[PDB]
């Protein structure tokens, strides 16, 4: 009741900005993660027992792959704490506890391989969820370990409150599934750009929860350029494991995932950088002002991306 989570100094300073990384001690992660539930939803959200007991359930769901992992999954509901917090008045009590847990649930067993991979190998998941097929599987393992005796976070909310809340949560992880963002960040695009956009439209706030996660999912080009630089290492480690494997199916594999095409790493970013990244974090900036550190941190990776093409790097 009267049990404020601290940090360091310097955490507790750095963890309010956009470009935080939360850093190698893997035991202060939970910690992390905690401090932000109570500053940007209070200390009343959640029973501390049943939350600490679902925090470590989630991370025993993770699974030790190069880049979705436990660390990705703190990094995300990191970025999602700093939008909430930098745009306090927007949102309802329910998708500020809503939103952090599906951040961190977002990629709950992830197997570091693609949607597309699962559907060539004829993986069992690709048979029960025809598309999105590893989004719908994270949220299958998020109601999974919400139903384990004494991780009901969500006990004090009604009938109503709570299926609102799950709500939230599956169309906020069904989001993250990339092949659907490219739709969902044109239809805004036209909505703002001609005023239909509508903050009271249970659709609209829809579609700005989404793009707010693939902001999330995406921030690793947001940081810090040797934050950036060494994540993109472990992205490719994935990328490049999944590409041998289409490779055994008897697959080429796309550029993306042949580690033959190494050196046009620095190509596929810009790429990514202008198709994926600069789009998601302009829209995001034009809906939400306050999170045009993002963009801003975005260009500043893209122009470091060119200077390693350049040779300057
Ligand atoms: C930085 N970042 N953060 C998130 C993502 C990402 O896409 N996802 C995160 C993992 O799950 C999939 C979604 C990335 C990223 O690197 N994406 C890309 C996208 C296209 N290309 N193409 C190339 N090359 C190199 C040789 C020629 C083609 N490399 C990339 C990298
Ligand atoms: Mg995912
Ligand atoms: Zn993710």
Redesign the pocket.
């Known amino acids: 009741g009267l049990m404020q989570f601290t940090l360091p100094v310097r955490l507790c300073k750095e963890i309010e900005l956009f470009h935080f990384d939360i850093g190698p001690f893997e035991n202060m992660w939970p910690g992390i993660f905690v401090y932000m539930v109570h500053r940007s939803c209070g200390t009343s959200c959640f029973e501390l027992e049943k939350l600490c007991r679902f925090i470590m359930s989630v991370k025993k769901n993770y699974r030790r792959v190069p ?1 979705h992992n436990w660390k990705h999954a703190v990094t995300v509901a990191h970025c999602m704490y700093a939008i909430l917090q930098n745009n306090h008045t927007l949102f309802t009590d329910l998708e500020r506890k809503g939103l952090l847990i599906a951040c961190l649930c977002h990629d709950l067993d992830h197997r570091g391989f ?1 949607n597309s991979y699962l559907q060539k190998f004829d993986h069992p998941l690709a048979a029960l969820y025809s598309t999105s097929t590893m989004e719908q599987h994270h949220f299958s393992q998020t109601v999974s370990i919400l139903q384990l005796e004494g991780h009901n976070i969500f006990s004090t909310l009604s009938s109503s409150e709570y299926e609102q809340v799950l709500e939230i949560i599956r169309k906020a992880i069904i989001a993250t599934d ?1 092949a659907l963002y490219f739709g969902n960040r044109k239809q805004l695009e036209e909505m703002y750009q001609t005023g239909s956009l509508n903050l009271n439209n249970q659709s609209h706030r829809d579609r700005v929860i989404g793009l707010m996660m693939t902001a999330c999912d ?1 921030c ?2 947001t940081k810090l350029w040797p934050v950036t630089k060494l ?2 290492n472990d ?1 490719y480690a ?1 990328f490049w494991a999944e590409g041998d494997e289409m490779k055994k199916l008897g697959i080429q594999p796309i ?2 995932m042949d580690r033959d ?1 190494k050196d ?2 620095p ?3 810009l ?2 950088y202008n198709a ?1 990244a600069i789009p998601c974090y302009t829209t995001l900036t034009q809906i939400l002002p306050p999170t045009e550190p993002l963009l801003k941190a975005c260009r500043d990776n893209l122009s470091q991306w060119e200077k390693v093409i350049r040779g300057e790097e």
């Open positions: 880049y693609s990339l995406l690793s080009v994540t993109a992205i994935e550029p993306m095409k046009e790493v190509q596929g970013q790429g990514f994926v």
